[PDB]
Nucleic acid binder design. Structure first.
Ligand SMILES: [Mg+2]
Ligand SMILES: [Mg+2]
Ligand SMILES: [Mg+2]
Ligand SMILES: [Mg+2]
Ligand SMILES: [Mg+2]
Ligand SMILES: [Mg+2]
Ligand SMILES: [Zn+2]
Ligand SMILES: [Zn+2]
Ligand SMILES: [Zn+2]
Ligand SMILES: [Zn+2]
Ligand SMILES: [Zn+2]
Ligand SMILES: [Zn+2]
Lengths: 104, 104
DNA sequence: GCCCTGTCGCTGAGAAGCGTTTGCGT
DNA sequence: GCCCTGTCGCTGAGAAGCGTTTGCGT
């Protein structure tokens, strides 16, 4: 299988450092092929904090969104999403507008 | 990867025995977990001859249909499909009416 | 030029087959 | 009953991240 396992992170396990590491400008991202995480929207693998979809039916990394992409494409803040126990990713809500999902 | 490789069989390599082995009644199928092939429509893995999708963009076993399913669900004969160099499976044509594909 | 500082292309990827499985009531 | 002899449920499955990548011309 090519799919990375999806693990749901509880809201009470979100730390201050992770909140401070949410990207505020896409040009300031730090790339890392091993420790980074890929944002579903912009498809860049970087070390900034990204969202975690808490829908049990979600899979893979489709639920991971960076700071700028979540606010610019959906008007939501990553910090609010990380502290929301019922937050579902735009792919799970069927409203993703990335270049791949809006084709069909 | 869980996907079986898709191999396109040329029309000139279809033999008489394979044509004679096309299923004419679903109750007469012979099941075999190792040598059988799965029909996409009825999801039964049997030894009767099934279609081969010749679209290069096809993948997996979605293009394999048994005799009764092809004629009853799409009005096409497996023998005609096997001898058609440009035959595409109903999933490739977006007209599949199996229980999984017609949901969405 | 303006303010809200932003994004898509490409490769290879995209289940399969078991059990609980065989038409409609027009 | 009829003729054309038929089909769905369930489990686990359903990419990810590289390069060619950063708003519109209203
Ligand atoms: Mg391939
Ligand atoms: Mg069986
Ligand atoms: Mg009815
Ligand atoms: Mg799973
Ligand atoms: Mg790179
Ligand atoms: Mg324009
Ligand atoms: Zn992003
Ligand atoms: Zn999700
Ligand atoms: Zn998307
Ligand atoms: Zn079949
Ligand atoms: Zn096909
Ligand atoms: Zn189908």
């Amino acid at each position: 299988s090519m799919t990375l396992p999806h693990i749901i992170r509880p809201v009470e396990e979100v730390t201050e450092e992770e909140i401070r590491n949410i990207c505020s400008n896409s040009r300031e991202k730090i790339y890392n092929r091993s420790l980074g995480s890929t944002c579903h929207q912009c498809r860049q693998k970087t070390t900034d904090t990204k969202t975690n979809c808490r829908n049990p039916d979600c899979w893979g990394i489709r639920g991971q969104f960076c700071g700028p992409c979540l606010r610019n494409r959906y008007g939501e803040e990553v910090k609010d999403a990380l502290l929301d126990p019922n937050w579902h990713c735009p792919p799970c809500r069927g409203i993703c507008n990335c270049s791949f999902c809006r084709q069909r």
